[PDB]
Subunit: 297 residues, 4 copies
Amino acid sequence: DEPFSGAKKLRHLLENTDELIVCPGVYDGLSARTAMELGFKSLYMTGAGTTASRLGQPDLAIAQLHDMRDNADMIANLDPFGPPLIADMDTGYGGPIMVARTVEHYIRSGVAGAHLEDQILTKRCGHLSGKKVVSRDEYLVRIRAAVATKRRLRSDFVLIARTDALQSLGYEECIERLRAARDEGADVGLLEGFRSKEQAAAAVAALAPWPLLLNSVENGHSPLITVEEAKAMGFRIMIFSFATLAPAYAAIRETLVRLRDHGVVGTPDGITPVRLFEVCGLQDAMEVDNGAGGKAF
Amino acid sequence: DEPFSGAKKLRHLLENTDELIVCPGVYDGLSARTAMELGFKSLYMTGAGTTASRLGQPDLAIAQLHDMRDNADMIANLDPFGPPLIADMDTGYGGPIMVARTVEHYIRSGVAGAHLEDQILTKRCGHLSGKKVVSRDEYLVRIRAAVATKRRLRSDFVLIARTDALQSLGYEECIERLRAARDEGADVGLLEGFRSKEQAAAAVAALAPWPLLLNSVENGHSPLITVEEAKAMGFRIMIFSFATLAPAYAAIRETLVRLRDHGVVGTPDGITPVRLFEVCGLQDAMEVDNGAGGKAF
Amino acid sequence: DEPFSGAKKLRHLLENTDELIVCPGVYDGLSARTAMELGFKSLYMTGAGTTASRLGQPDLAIAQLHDMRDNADMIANLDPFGPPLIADMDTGYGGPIMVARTVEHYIRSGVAGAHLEDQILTKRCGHLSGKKVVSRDEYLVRIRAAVATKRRLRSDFVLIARTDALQSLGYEECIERLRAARDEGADVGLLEGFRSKEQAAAAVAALAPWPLLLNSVENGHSPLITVEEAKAMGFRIMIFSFATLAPAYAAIRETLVRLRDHGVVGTPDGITPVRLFEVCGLQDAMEVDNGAGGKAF
Amino acid sequence: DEPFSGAKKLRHLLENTDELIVCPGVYDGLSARTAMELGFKSLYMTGAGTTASRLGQPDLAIAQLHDMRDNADMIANLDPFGPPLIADMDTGYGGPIMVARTVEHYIRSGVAGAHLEDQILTKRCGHLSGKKVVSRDEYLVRIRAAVATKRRLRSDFVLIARTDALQSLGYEECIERLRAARDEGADVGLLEGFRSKEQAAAAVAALAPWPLLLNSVENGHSPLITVEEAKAMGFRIMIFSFATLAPAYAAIRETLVRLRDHGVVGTPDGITPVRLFEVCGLQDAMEVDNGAGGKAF
Ligand SMILES: O=C(O)C(O)(O)C(F)(F)C(=O)O
Ligand SMILES: O=C(O)C(O)(O)C(F)(F)C(=O)O
Ligand SMILES: O=C(O)C(O)(O)C(F)(F)C(=O)O
Ligand SMILES: O=C(O)C(O)(O)C(F)(F)C(=O)O
Ligand SMILES: [Ca+2]
Ligand SMILES: [Ca+2]
Ligand SMILES: [Ca+2]
Ligand SMILES: [Ca+2]
Ligand SMILES: [Mn+2]
Ligand SMILES: [Mn+2]
Ligand SMILES: [Mn+2]
Ligand SMILES: [Mn+2]
C-alpha cells in the first residue's frame, strides 16, 4: 500500500497468486507511461531498449550501471504507487563488488526485481550468436553477491537468475545452473532463448515448483509463445523485451519516410501534444501547482 | 569535413544555400538513429520529447540543463561526421549565468544550434494556454548572454531567438522582439505558434532577409503547413517537433493493447532485434572490435 | 533500524530528544566518509560545496535538481544504516511542480530532510549581498508544495523552512515568514545569516517550541556561535556549511604551492592510499567479494 | 589558441619542448580550480580520487565510463582556454567497443590525453597487492582500439600506455608491453609502481626517445622521486595522483575532530565563502551577468 513498494508488490504477486505476471518491455518514459495507462500489473525494463534509447547504441555491454540505474529509477517511480518494475541488470556490470552495488542501487531506487545473467562481461543480446558464458562457479559468485545484498538490505527484491548457456553449452547445463542459482537464493529462473516450445515446457517442469520467467523477444530467434501458451506451460512471469521498442521504430521510420517524401508527418490527429502530456502525468503536475496555491494552471 | 563540426555544417547550409532545412524532431537514440538512417540533413531535439522520454513527464520546465545537455550530447554525436543537431534550450534554465553555461555546454557537446525563448522560467509547451513571457528587456538579457558566449567560444553555433509572445501580447510584439534579438546577434528567428498561414508568410516578409525557422507541431494548435508551403513562404529552417514522439506513442499504445487483449505483440516481422541494432550502429561496433584485433564478432 | 531510514532517524532525534543535532557540512564522498568515520550523528550536504566540488562553480543557482539529488543520493547511502542526511534543496529549482519533484526525489533517495528557501530562483549564497527574496505568498507556495509531497509519500522527511529575508526585509519579516511556514507544515525553521548572537537567541524564543536550525558559515558574515552557545540558545539543529570545503581548500592550496615551489607533495605519511580506501569503504568491498566466494581479496 | 584545445596544447608541450610536464592530480572542481589558480601547465584527473569524491568508494573498478567522463568533462572545461587535462581511463571500461567509446567521449569532452592500462577489468589501485593483468595480446587490443579511435577522430589526443605488469610479471615484461604499445601507436608510456629509482631511470633509457610518464603516488609503495630527480631521469610527464585527495582528507579530518571535540571549525579566517567562490569562477559569472545587461551583481 506504501509508496516505493514495488518489490513487495511483485513478491506478493509471485508468492500469493498463481497468475502469469505479464510485463511489457519498456525503455523510456513514454513507453512506461503507456504501459501504465493501459493497466499492466508489472513492467519490464529492457537493457537492449535502454541502450538503444538512452545511448543510441546496440546491446553490446555499452550501457553500464549508471545508465541502467538511471533509467530504472526514472521508470519505477513515475508513479510511487504504481506497478512493480523488473529491470535487466545484465551481468551486474563487473565483479561481485559491482553486482552488489547494482542490486543495492536498484533496491534503493524502488526497483522490484532484476535478472542477472552468466554472460561474460563483454556481453551481447541473448539472441545474437557468438554468445559466451562464464563458468558455473563464476556465475554463482554473481548470484551470491546479489542475494547477500538483498538480504543485507532486508528487501523483498525479486532476483531472477538468467542463464545464456543454452547457445554454447546446451540444455542440461542451463538446468544445472538454474538449480545451483536457486540454492544460492535466486527467486526465479530465466532460461534465455528457448529453441522449442517443448523445451520451454520441459524447463518449467524440471525446476518446478521454483518459478520461471519466459523472455519473449519479438521477432527474435525463439518460438512465438502466446500468453495463454506460457500460462499453460506453468511460467509465472513473462516479459516482452521488444514490445515497445520494435513498434516505436516501425512507426517512427514510416512517419519520417512520409515526411521525407511528402512533406507531412501524418500522425493520427488524436495524438495531440496535450494527450501526450496527459499520458505523461500532466494532471498530476497541474494538481501539484493548484494544490500549492499556485494559479499557473 | 571534421568530426564534431555540426555548427559549421548548419551554418554553411544557412549561409551558403537557399534550401529549406528540414529537421525532424527526435527525442532519443532510436528516433535520432532512424532520422539519420533516412538521410535527413539536420535533426532537431525536442525539449517536450526529451522530457517525455528521459523523464516521463510533461513539458512543464521539468527537464533542466543536465537532462537537456545529456540528451543533446548523445544525439549530436551518434555520428561524429553526421548531420547537425539543433537543440531546444528552452529559457536557458535560469538567469544570464545559466543561459551562458547552457550555450557553452551545447557548443562543447557539438550541438549545431539551439532555440532560446522569452517564456517565464516556469515555462510550458508553446501550444498550451496560460503561457506568459518576460519583458523585452529581460528576454534580451538572455539573448545577449547566449550571443556573448558563442562569440567568446569562437563558435559557428546557430542561435535561434524564439518568441512565445503571440499568445499573450500579439503579432507586432513578436516582430519587435525578433528584430531586437536579431540586433543582439541571434542568427535566426522563430515566431512560435502562428495562428494562420497568412501570418506565417507575413512574419517572414517582416524580418527578411534575416532567416526564420518554422516550428511545425504535429496535431497541435497551429495551421498545418507543408514543407513545400513553408519553402514558398521563405522560411529557411523547418522543425517537426512531434514527428517521432507522436507516432511512437500511437504504435506503442496499439501494440500494448494487442498484447493486453490478445497475448501477442504482433509487430511486423522485419523489425528484428538485429535490425534495430543495425539502425543503432551495430556495424560500427563490430568493426571497432574486428579492427582492434578482437575476434568477438 | 531499517536501511534507508534516515528520515525516521532524524525525526526521532528531533522529536524524541532535546539534543542539539550537530551536522558537519559535507560536499562529496571523501568529506562525508570522514564525518561518518568520526561518528557524527547527522550530516549536512551543502549546496555551495556541492556546486564547488561537482561543478567547479560558485553558489549562484548553477547546480540544479539533477546535480543536487545525485550528490545527496550518493552521500545519504554510503552507509544504508548510517547517519541521516539533511540536504540543501535551495529554492526547489523551479515552481511548485519542481519543488514537489525535488522533495519526492530526495525522499526516494533516502535523504532525511532538506532546507527550502525564499530566495528568487536566480539565488546566491546567503552570505552574499544583493540577495532578494520572493513575496511571502510565493514562498508559501513552495512550502505547501513540499509539505504536500512529503505527506503524499507518507514520509517522515524533515522539511526545514529557510528564510533569507533578513538582509533585505529585516527581522520581523523573517519571524512572520517562519511562523507562516510552520503553519503550512514545515518541521523546523532556519533564519539565515543572523547579524548578532542576541538576535539568534531572540529568534529561538520567538518561535519556541517550534525547533530552529542554526546555519554556521565558517569565515562568513555571521557571528561565530559555538556548539555550546547554540545549545544554550535553544537551537535543535546546527549545520556547519563550510566545515569541510574550507579546510580542504586551505590544505590543497598549501600542498600544491609546495609541489610547485619545491617539487614534493609533503602530505603527512599516515595518509596512504590504503587508508583513504579504508575511509571510503574498502573493508565493506573486500567482504562483499570474499563473502560471495570470490578470491580477489 | 582556440577554446577546447587541450589535446593540441599537451601535444605541443610534449613534441615541442623538453620540459618535464608537471600535473597535479585533481579529483573535483575545487581541487582543479586550485591547481589552475596556482598556474600549473597541465592537470591530471585521478581515477582513485574521482571514485573517492564522486562516489565515496575505493578504487576497485567502481567508477565506470559515465562517472569518469562526467568528472573529466567538468574539470577539462572549467576554463575553455586553460591547461590541458590528462585523465585516467583505467582499462577502458570494457572490451574494445568500450575502449573506443571511452576515448571518443574523452576527446569530445576536450580531454587532452588519458592513460589506459593492462589490468583485468575487475581492476584495483596500482599500489595494492593481488593485482593481475591481461595477456599482452589482450592489452594490445585495448591500445589498438584507442589509437584507431583518436586517429578516426583526427585528434591530437595523447594516449598513454600504462602497464601494471611489474607486480606480477616483472620488469622485462613491462618494457616489452610498452614497446609493443608504442608500435601500436601509444604516444607515451607509463610503467606503474617502480620499485626503485634505479629502475625508473632504466625504464626511461630502455624506451628513449619515446616519452615516459612517471606516476608519483603520495604515501604509496613506490620511491619518493622529486620533480628535479624525475627531470634528470628523462621523464617527460610526471603526475601526482594523490596530491590533492590526501591533504584534503588530512585537513577535513583534523577540522571535524576539532568540531567534534571543541565545537568550532577553526579554519584559517582568510578562507571565506567569497574567496572560495572567487577560486571557483565568481568573477567570470558576475561578468556574464553584467555583460548581458543584467544588474544582479
Ligand atoms: O531486453 C533485454 O535487454 C533482454 O535481455 O531481455 C534481451 F532481449 F536483449 C535479451 O538478451 O534476450
Ligand atoms: O519540441 C519542443 O520542445 C517545442 O519547443 O518545439 C514544442 F513543440 F514543445 C513547443 O513548445 O512548440
Ligand atoms: O552550504 C550551503 O549551500 C548554505 O546554503 O548553507 C550556504 F552556506 F551557502 C548559505 O547560503 O548560507
Ligand atoms: O590516481 C589514479 O587513479 C592512479 O591510477 O594514478 C592510481 F594512483 F590510483 C594508481 O593506480 O597508481
Ligand atoms: Ca496529424
Ligand atoms: Ca512479429
Ligand atoms: Ca608524504
Ligand atoms: Ca575561521
Ligand atoms: Mn538485456
Ligand atoms: Mn520546447
Ligand atoms: Mn545553499
Ligand atoms: Mn587509476
